[PDB]
Each structure stands twice: as structure tokens, then as C-alpha cells.
Design a protein around this ligand. Structure first.
Ligand code: CL
Ligand code: CL
Ligand code: NA
Ligand code: NA
Ligand code: NA
Ligand code: NA
Lengths: 263, 74, 76
């Protein structure tokens, strides 16, 4: 609970069954929890009924087992060297799930990230990884200044532009800079719209927004994020948080996506 | 700038803050408007807890954002 | 030797170092003053990311030079 290695387990009535989800007390394990909550919700990993507390070690061990059990799609005895490599490098980044997982978003599409071992953890498990940090087409300057650049590339580009003699580059630097300031919470309306259309009905996925990872789903054409903060541990009726705006003004719902209340 | 703080009862608290304000400051402002002691307050934005010692700016909390107020673990 | 580290927010960090110091050392100093983990730090100077195993001297970083600190996107 208070200890970093420990986490409070919340039991919820999910599709006819008492099902566990893991709550978060401190910043750092969001990625681990986002993945494990999917596995728990899918009933792929199962916990003793009325288990209350769970450790990083445990979560890691369950996750390790799941990853190493994945089979290649080609299912061919020959080759498959590329698959084993993926598995190895995913197992190497695994500890980072508990302490803070790095991602490098592309502002072009909801699924666009620089492909890294971090991303491969999600791929192997067949879990989509999404963001909504998309440059709006309506703004031509941002689309050209940002272009196909990743977050990592864009910040260096800004530094260069800041130092450049070429007044066109200076100008581009300032537009890119402006884009990062106004979209600092890492979700744009365009991105939210694009994500709502792209996500699949009933599918569980991981959503990276504002230096956080959430378990996301789509139900009746509407995006929802699993409520994990331990502040809501005792609130059985607060399971899913609606995702229909960028300013955080959400509606809470129960396990079955019905609006809840505490009054 | 203005932010909003929604409780679970449905009540909305309006606050005047600056990006440079710490989470502590914000909790103090909530203690000026409501009866609630800072140490009983736990603030969340976009599903993540806001830790004391960080600023609104640290969490990229811009004007007219909605935060969620719940009760503290410790 | 004294150097400066500018963030994108505009804030500047002063550091006390030696040409022989590794980039890893400098990142450790940045952790001591800001609490940013070394592995989340990317230091930029004269258009290139600074690699951990090289020294300030290797990059020709002399006194009162300004480095730029950018953070990796880490979701906690
Ligand atoms: Cl237990
Ligand atoms: Cl669909
Ligand atoms: Na927007
Ligand atoms: Na699914
Ligand atoms: Na509500
Ligand atoms: Na400068």
C-alpha cells in the first residue's frame, strides 16, 4: 500500500465475475499496471479471491510468464530468429515498467511511436499502444514545422533553430516551440477525435497521456480509461473514466459503463 | 489563471492559481475555500495523482483544467 | 571549471566540473541539484547528443559553455 513494491488490489464485478485490478499510490509503475490490468481484465492472469496486496515482484513474474509463453504468428519450425530477439529485448526493458517507461511519440498518428524495445513489450502481448498527441492539420505551420519528427527529434530541432542564422529556421523553431507549449498535456482535440475512431470496440489497449500510461477501452463508440488511483480503492462504482475532452473534465462510470455517483 | 476541482459528491470548486504554484499551494487554496485540511486532500489529473512538491507546470496543468479531489492515503 | 545547463522552460543550472569529467558525471551532478534521473537526461551541445562514456574535454566543452538539457518522455 504505502511501500513502493506493494500495491492495493481492487475487486470489481467485470462481465459476471469478481475480477482484480491494481491501484497506483505513487508515480513510476503506470506502464506495469496498464499492461497487468489488461491481462487481469482478460482473465489471462488470475489471483486468489480476496487477495488485497500484491508486489512488483509478483506482477513482474506473472508478466514474465505471459511474454515467454507467446508463440510466433508464422508458427513455422524454420527461422523465427527475429521473434526470439524481440522476446529477449522485451525481457530486458521489463524492469522499467515499474520505475518509468520511456516512449518517443510521433505527432502524425495515434499509433505512431519510434519503434523501440519498450514498444515491443506491448506488440508481443498483442496490446495496442496509443497516444493522442497529434498536430492538427487545420494548422499548416505546425504540420510543416513538426513534420514526421518524433518528440526526441523535435526538441533538438528547436535548439538548432534557436541558434540558426536562417530566419526561416528561427521561425520554424518558434512554431514548434509554440506547439509543445500549448499541447503540453500531450492530448489534442484532433488526437482525441482520431483516437476515438481508430480504437476498436471492446478492445483493451494502453494509452500514453501526460507522462502516464492508462488502460483504455472503447464502449459504444466512446473512449474510457481504467481508474487506478488508490484514492478510489473503496469506490466500487468508480471503475471507468470517460475520455471525451482534453481538459480533464470527465464522467465516472461503474464496471459496465453506467454513470455512477456518491450522492 | 482558473482551474476547477471536482469532488465525488458532484461539487465543483473554482480556484485562482499560477503555473508556478506547488500542489501544496493549491491544497492550501482548497482549505481557504472549503473546510478541508491539506493533509486529507489527494489531487488527481487525467488519472494520475499530483504529488506535493511539484508544480502545476510540472504536470502540464493549463487554464480551465479539471482536477479531481479525493481523500488521502497518507 | 563552471558550466551552464539550460532547460526548455528557460531555467538555468550552474555546475562545477573539470574537463576530465565524464558526461555520466555531469548527469549525476544534475541529479544532485534537480532530482532528474541520469537515464532520463539527454544533454545537447553544438548539435550533438553527448554520450555517457566521453569527457567534457572530448567535446571541447570549456568554461562557461552552455549545454541544453532535454528529458525523455517517461510516464510514471
Ligand atoms: Cl493478501
Ligand atoms: Cl470499431
Ligand atoms: Na487542442
Ligand atoms: Na481486448
Ligand atoms: Na460524474
Ligand atoms: Na541559449
Amino acid at each position: 500500500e504505502m511501500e513502493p513494491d506493494f500495491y492495493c488490489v481492487k475487486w470489481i464485478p467485470w462481465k459476471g465475475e469478481q475480477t482484480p485490478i491494481i491501484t497506483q499510490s505513487t508515480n513510476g509503475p503506470a506502464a506495469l499496471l496498464a499492461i497487468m490490468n489488461i491481462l487481469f481484465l482478460q482473465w489471462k492472469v488470475k489471483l486468489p479471491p480476496q487477495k488485497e496486496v500484491i508486489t512488483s515482484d509478483e506482477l513482474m513474474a506473472h508478466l514474465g510468464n505471459c511474454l515467454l509463453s507467446i508463440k510466433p504468428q508464422e508458427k513455422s519450425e524454420g527461422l523465427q530468429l527475429n521473434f526470439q530477439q524481440n522476446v529477449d529485448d522485451a525481457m530486458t526493458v521489463l524492469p522499467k515498467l515499474a520505475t518509468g517507461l520511456d516512449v518517443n511519440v510521433r505527432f502524425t498518428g495515434v499509433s505512431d511511436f519510434e519503434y523501440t524495445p519498450e514498444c515491443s513489450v506491448f506488440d508481443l502481448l498483442g496490446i495496442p499502444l496509443y497516444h493522442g498527441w497529434l498536430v492538427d492539420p487545420q494548422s499548416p505551420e505546425a504540420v510543416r514545422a513538426v513534420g514526421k519528427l518524433s518528440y526526441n527529434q523535435l526538441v533538438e530541432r528547436i535548439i538548432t533553430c534557436k541558434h540558426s542564422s536562417d530566419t526561416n529556421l528561427v521561425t520554424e523553431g518558434l512554431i514548434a516551440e509554440q506547439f509543445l507549449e500549448t499541447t503540453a498535456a500531450q492530448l489534442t482535440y484532433h488526437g482525441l477525435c482520431e483516437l476515438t475512431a481508430a480504437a476498436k470496440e471492446g478492445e483493451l489497449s494502453v494509452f500514453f497521456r501526460n507522462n502516464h500510461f492508462s488502460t483504455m477501452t472503447k464502449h459504444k463508440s466512446h473512449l474510457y480509461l481504467l481508474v487506478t488511483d488508490q484514492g478510489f480503492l473503496q469506490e466500487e462504482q468508480v471503475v471507468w473514466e470517460s475520455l471525451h475532452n482534453v481538459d480533464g473534465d470527465s464522467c465516472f462510470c461503474d464496471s459496465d459503463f453506467h454513470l455512477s455517483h456518491s450522492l | 489563471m482558473q482551474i476547477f476541482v471536482k469532488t465525488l459528491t458532484g461539487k465543483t470548486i473554482t480556484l485562482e492559481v499560477e503555473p508556478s504554484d506547488t500542489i501544496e499551494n493549491v491544497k492550501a487554496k482548497i482549505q481557504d475555500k472549503e473546510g478541508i485540511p491539506p493533509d486529507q486532500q489527494r489531487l488527481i489529473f487525467a488519472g494520475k495523482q499530483l504529488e506535493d512538491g511539484r508544480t502545476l507546470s510540472d504536470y502540464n496543468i493549463q487554464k480551465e483544467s479539471t482536477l479531481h479531489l479525493v481523500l488521502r492515503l497518507r
